[PDB]
Amino acid sequence: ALQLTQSPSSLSASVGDRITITCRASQGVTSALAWYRQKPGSPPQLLIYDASSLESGVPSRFSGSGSGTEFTLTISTLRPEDFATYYCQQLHFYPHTFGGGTRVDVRRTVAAPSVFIFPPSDRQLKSGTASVVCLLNNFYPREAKVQWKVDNALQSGNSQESVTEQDSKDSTYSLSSTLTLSKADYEKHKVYECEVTHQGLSSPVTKSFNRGEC
Amino acid sequence: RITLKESGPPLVKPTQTLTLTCSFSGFSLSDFGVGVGWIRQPPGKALEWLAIIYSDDDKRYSPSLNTRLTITKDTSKNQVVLVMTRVSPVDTATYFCAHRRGPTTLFGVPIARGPVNAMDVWGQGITVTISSTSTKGPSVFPLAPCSTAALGCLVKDYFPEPVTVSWNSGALTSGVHTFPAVLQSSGLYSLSSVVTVPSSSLGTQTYTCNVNHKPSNTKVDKRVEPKS
Amino acid sequence: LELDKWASL
Numbered sequence: 292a293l294q295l296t297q298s299p300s301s302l303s304a305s306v307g308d309r310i311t312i313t314c315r316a317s318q319g320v321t322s323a324l325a326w327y328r329q330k331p332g333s334p335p336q337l338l339i340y341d342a343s344s345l346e347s348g349v350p351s352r353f354s355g356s357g358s359g360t361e362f363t364l365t366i367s368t369l370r371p372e373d374f375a376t377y378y379c380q381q382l383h384f385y386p387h388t389f390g391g392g393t394r395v396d397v398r399r400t401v402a403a404p405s406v407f408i409f410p411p412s413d414r415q416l417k418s419g420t421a422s423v424v425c426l427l428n429n430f431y432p433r434e435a436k437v438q439w440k441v442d443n444a445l446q447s448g449n450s451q452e453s454v455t456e457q458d459s460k461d462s463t464y465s466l467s468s469t470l471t472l473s474k475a476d477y478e479k480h481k482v483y484e485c486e487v488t489h490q491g492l493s494s495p496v497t498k499s500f501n502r503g504e505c
Numbered sequence: 506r507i508t509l510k511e512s513g514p515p516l517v518k519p520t521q522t523l524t525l526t527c528s529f530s531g532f533s534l535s536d537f538g539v540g541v542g543w544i545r546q547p548p549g550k551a552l553e554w555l556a557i558i559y560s561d562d563d564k565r566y567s568p569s570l571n572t573r574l575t576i577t578k579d580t581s582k583n584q585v586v587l588v589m590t591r592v593s594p595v596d597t598a599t600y601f602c603a604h605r606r607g608p609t610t611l612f613g614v615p616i617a618r619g620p621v622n623a624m625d626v627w628g629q630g631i632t633v634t635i636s637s638t639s640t641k642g643p644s645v646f647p648l649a650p651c652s653t654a655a656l657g658c659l660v661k662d663y664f665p666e667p668v669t670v671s672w673n674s675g676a677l678t679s680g681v682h683t684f685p686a687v688l689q690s691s692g693l694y695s696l697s698s699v700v701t702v703p704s705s706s707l708g709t710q711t712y713t714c715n716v717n718h719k720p721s722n723t724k725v726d727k728r729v730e731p732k733s
Numbered sequence: 734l735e736l737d738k739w740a741s742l
Contacts, residue, residue, distance in 0.1 A: 292554035292567060323737065325623035327552075334601050334630050335544075335552060340623030378552050382605075382622050385735040386567045387542070389552040405701070407655040409648040415661070422659055424648055428682070428701055451687040453696070467684040467697045469659070500651035505733070540738070563738060608742055618742045 293317070293388030295381050300391060303398035303432060304369050311365040312393045314379035319359040323383035326355050326364040329392075330375045331456060338377075339364060369395075374457075396433065399462040403491030404430030408484075408498040411477065421477030423470040425485035425498070429463040436488040437468045440499075441480045446470055477502065507531030509541070509602050509628035516665060518637045523592045527585040527602030527628060534560050534580045538607020538615070541585040542624055543576065547598040548685075557605060558585060597634045597688060603627040636692035638664045642723025645716050648699060649732050654707055656729050657699030658714035662691070669717040670698040674726075677712070707731050 294317035304310050314324065322342040327335035337346045339355035342362055352367045366373055374397055379390040404427035411421040427435055433454065439446035452468035468485070484499035513525040525543070532539055542557030556566040556576045566574050575588040585602060603624035608615035643663035649656050660668055670683045677700060686696035698714055713728040 322619075323622040323739075329552075334627040335624075336627070337623050337625045340625065341619040342622070344619055346623070346625060380552070380554075380624070383737050383740060385565045385737060386569075387554045387557070387737070389544075389554065392551045405653075405655070407650050409657070409659075410651050412646040412648075412659075415644070415646045415659075418644065420661075422646070422661065422695075424657075424659060424697055426648075426655055426657070426682075426697075426699055428655065428699075451689065451695075453684040453687050455682055455684060465682045465684070465699075467682075467699070469687070469695065469697065471689075538739070559738065565735075565738075608739060615742055618739045621739045 292386035293381050293384055295379055295388050295390040297377070297379055297390035297393045299393060301394045301396070301433065303396055305398050306369055306371060308369045309365065309367050310369055310395065311363050312377050314362045314364070314390050316360045316381055318384075320381040320383035322358050323381060324357070324362050325380045325382065327378045327380065328373070328375050329378065330372065335378060394433070396457050397462040399431050401491040402429060402431045402463055404428055404435060404466070404487060404489055406485065406487050406496055406498045408500060410483065410500050410502065416474050416477070419474050421472045421474050423472070423483050425468045425470070425487075427466040427487055427489070429458070429461055429465055430489055430491060431463045432490060433457070433464045434490070435466055437466065438486040438488070439468070439470045440482075440484040440486060442482050507604055507626045509604060509626060511600060511602050511628045511631035513600070513631055513633065515632060516634050516636065517592055519593050519635055520591055523589040523596070523633065525587045525589070525600055525602075525631065525633075527587070529583050529585070529602075529604065532604060533583070534578050534585065536560055536607060537610060538621065540605030540607070541578065541602055542605055543587045543600060543602050544624070545598040545600045546630070547595070556587065560607065592635045594635050594688070594692065597636070599630040599632045601627050601630040634665060634688070636664065636688065638692040640664060640721045641693060642718045642721035643668060643716065645714070645725045645727045647727055647729040648697065649729060651732055653702070654704040655699055655701050656712055656731070657697055658716065658727055658729060659695070659697050660716055661695045662689075662693040663695070663718050663721070663723070664693045665720055666694055668694075668696065669719070670696070671715045672698070672700055673711070673713055674715055
C-alpha cells in the first residue's frame with residue numbers, strides 16, 4: 292500500500308499533555324484518511340474516519356483535521372491508554388496505505404544506557420557457533436544505535452537486536468543485540484567491540500574485549 | 506455489534522500456501538458496499554494493506570503481493586478467505602481482517618460516503634510464523650561480561666515460540682530484562698534474558714535462569730556467575 | 734495511481 296509519512300515517528304509525552312501527529316501524503320487523498328490507535332498486543336482501533344469524523348464510542352479528546360496532503364490527529368488531553376502507536380491510512384487510492392506509525396511513550400529525563408558486552412561461552416563455542424551479545428540497559432529515549440566491530444571491521448547482516456517495552460515504572464528501555472559468527476570465524480579475530488550511540492551519550496561509548504585474552 | 510475473527514495455521518513452512526479465514530458477524534457481505542479487507546503487521550513493524558473484497562464481489566490486492574494473493578468470500582457462511590501462495594519467512598506477521606463500511610444510504614440512496622473512509626472494525630488478528638524448522642528446544646548459554654553489573658542467559662535456537670524464562674525460580678525479578686526473541690535466518694528463535702545487579706551482590710547472591718520450552722519438553726536451569 | 738471504489742459517488 293501507498294506513500295504516507297507520519298511525523299513524528301516517535302513522540303514522548305505525559306498524561307494530561309496535548310499532542311498532535313501529522314500525516315503527509317505523496318499526493319492528495321481528499322478526506323479519505325483514517326487514524327488508528329494500536330495499543331501493545333491489540334489490533335488497531337479506529338479513532339477518526341474521513342479525516343475529521345469521530346468514530347462513535349471514541350472519546351472526544353481525539354480530533355483530526357486536514358485534507359489533500361496534510362492531516363493531523365490531536366489528542367487534547369493524553370490519557371494513560373493513549374501511550375500507544377498511531378497510524379494513518381489513506382483510502383482514496385488502491386492500494387490503501389498506512390503511514391509508518393507514530394509511537395507515543397512516557398516522557399522522562401534522558402538516561403544513557405549502561406552498556407555491557409558478553410563474549411560467547413566456551414559452552415557455545417564447543418557447538419561451533421559464537422554469539423556475542425551487547426546489552427544497553429535502562430535508557431531513554433528509545434532510539435539508540437548499536438554497531439558491531441570485529442578488529443575494526445564494521446559488521447553487517449550478522450546481528451539481530453530486540454528492545455523491551457517501556458518499563459512501567461522506569462519509563463526506560465533496554466536493548467539486546469547479538470552478533471553471531473561461526474567458531475571458526477570467531478577464532479580468526481581478536482577484538483570484539485560494541486559501539487553505542489545514544490542521545491544521552493556525549494560521544495559513542497564502546498565496550499569491547501579481546502578474544503582469548505585471559 | 507460487528508465482530509471479526511481470523512483463523513488459520515499459526516505455523517507454515519516456506520513455499521507452502523497460506524489460507525486465512527475471516528469469520529464475521531454483525532454484518533453481511535451482501536450488504537451494500539460493505540468491504541472486508543486484510544492487513545498484516547510484521548512483528549515490530551507498520552501495518553500493511555493486503556487486499557479487500559466487497560459485497561458486489563469487487564476485489565483489490567496489494568500490487569506487491571498481487572500474484573500471491575487470492576481473496577474470496579463466502580456470503581452464506583459470513584466468511585472471507587485470503588490465500589497467500591509461496592510464503593517465505595518475510596511473511597511472518599500478524600494478519601488482521603477488518604470491516605469497511607459501505608456508503609450510508611437513505612431509502613436505498615447513498616447519501617454519505619464519509620463512513621467508507623476507514624476500516625472501522627478489526628479482528629484480534631492471527632499471528633503466522635513462516636519457518637521450515639521443526640520443534641526444537643533451546644541451548645542455554647551463560648552471559649557473564651568479560652570484565653552496575655550484568656549477567657544473563659542466552660536462550661538459543663529453539664522453535665517454536667514461546668519460551669518461559671525466570672530467575673532464581675522466580676525470586677529475582679528486579680533488574681531483570683527478558684528480551685523479545687528474534688527469528689533467525691535459520692528459522693529458529695533466539696532470545697536473551699539478563700539481570701542487572703549492584704555488583705556487590707555478585708559475591709552474595711547466586712543467579713540461575715530457569716528456562717522452560719513447553720513445546721519441546723525442555724526445562725533447563727543455568728547458574729550464571731562472574732567471569733575469571 | 735489506482736482510484737478507490739468510492740472515489741466519487
